[PDB]
Amino acid sequence: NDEERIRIKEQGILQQGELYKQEGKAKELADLIKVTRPFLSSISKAKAAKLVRSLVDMFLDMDAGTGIEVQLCKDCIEWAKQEKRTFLRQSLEARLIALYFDTALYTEALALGAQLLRELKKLDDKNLLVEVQLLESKTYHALSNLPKARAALTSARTTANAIYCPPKVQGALDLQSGILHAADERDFKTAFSYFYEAFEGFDSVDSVKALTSLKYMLLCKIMLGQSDDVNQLVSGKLAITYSGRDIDAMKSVAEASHKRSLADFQAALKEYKKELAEDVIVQAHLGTLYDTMLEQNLCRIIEPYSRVQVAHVAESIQLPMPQVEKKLSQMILDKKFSGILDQGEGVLIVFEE
């Protein structure tokens, strides 16, 4: 009866907290957290955290107002400390770091991260340490500090060597390595391998992450100029399943690339504004991707000529000529093209490769 009426109670609380979340009543849920506190002392420290963690998770998926969200976390952490529930305090603090990150509150996502690690490093069961090291790698990268983001991730993967992780943890580790080889625009080749490991690892487990990895595999393939490969990849038995607007964007960019068409690439950037320009990681490579498209299109226009009017190239790509001259002279300077320019009577000469 008493091993029983407490179990029905745990259900009760979660279920009502669940109901508050659905009809979006943040105030009452903040109250539910405050009110359940006495109760928590009648169950194991371990079952306790489970409950408290579960509820704050409910609060943070509510659009409750960042400040109110952050408050509620500092409140529960405060309470956890003034109650000596260390494991839970720590795991609450980890959830707060996550919140700061998703909020763009990055200097504090570092400050708390800095604290919690000192603690976590001096202990066993490094599962949480991983969470936090990867979270650091994420936040350092969000702040543009590549070395210290690479540095944090190397730790994480080293920690994850002794343990055997859940696929979703593994997955995130491969997504990060993926992101970070790509970030300096320097190793799209191995960046791709991580994204493929990530994809292989997220597939049938977490399929938003799964889609994201695939998408990024495609990005890299494009970025390598290997956008022919893109079809065969999507084609394969497992990828098809993942059809959507994200995949259509990549296929559509891949296509502009194969066709060497800037006009198509402009078209695809604006039809797929959401899937591309608004994707933090894609958006990172759009700048230099834009260059390749311009160059490729220029090469395509130039290709039949051994000597061509700059005005002709300019009408053909539809850009002001002052600009178009400037670009071609840069390609010549940078050994990106084998020709020379008659600034005088407006002509570009092309040499036998």
Positions touching Gd ion (CB under 5 A) are 229, 271, 345
Shortest separation between residue 229's beta carbon and Gd ion, angstroms? 4
Shortest separation between residue 17's beta carbon and Gd ion, angstroms? 39
Computed from CA positions of residues 281, 201, 147, 336, in that sequence, does the dihedral angle turn out positive or negative? negative
Shortest separation between residue 179's beta carbon and Gd ion, angstroms? 18
Shortest separation between residue 153's beta carbon and Gd ion, angstroms? 19
Q: Output the six-digit token pair for 68.
A: 């109110």
Shortest separation between residue 270's beta carbon and Gd ion, angstroms? 8
Which residue of this chain has its Cβ atom nearest to Gd ion in the complex? 229
Shortest separation between residue 277's beta carbon and Gd ion, angstroms? 13
Rounded to whole angstroms, the Cα distance separating 242 from 207 reads 9
- Closer to Gd ion at the Cβ: 212 or 252? 252
- Closer to Gd ion at the Cβ: 104 or 277? 277
Rounded to whole angstroms, the Cα distance separating 307 from 160 reads 59
Can you point out the beta strands (E) in the chain? 307-309, 339-342, 347-350
Rounded to whole angstroms, the Cα distance separating 75 from 29 reads 14
Neighbours of 109 (CB within 10 A): 25
Distance of alpha carbon 147 from its chain centroid, rounded? 18
3-class DSSP assignment, residue 307: strand
- Closer to Gd ion at the Cβ: 27 or 168? 168
Rounded to whole angstroms, the Cα distance separating 340 from 121 reads 61
- Closer to Gd ion at the Cβ: 185 or 229? 229
Place of tokens 């202990």: 123
Rounded to whole angstroms, the Cα distance separating 307 from 348 reads 6
Per-residue b or e along 159-196, where b marks 16 or more CB atoms closer than 10 Å to that residue's CB: bbeeeebebebbbbbbbbbbbbbbbeeeebeebbbbbb
| Burial (CB count <10 Å: 0-12, 13-18, 19+), residue 244 | exposed
- Closer to Gd ion at the Cβ: 139 or 176? 176
Shortest separation between residue 200's beta carbon and Gd ion, angstroms? 5
Shortest separation between residue 267's beta carbon and Gd ion, angstroms? 11
Q: Output the six-digit token pair for 138.
A: 């994420």
- Closer to Gd ion at the Cβ: 100 or 195? 195
- Closer to Gd ion at the Cβ: 115 or 231? 231
- Residues in CB range of 105: below 8 A, 6 or more apart: 66, 70, 99
- Closer to Gd ion at the Cβ: 23 or 345? 345
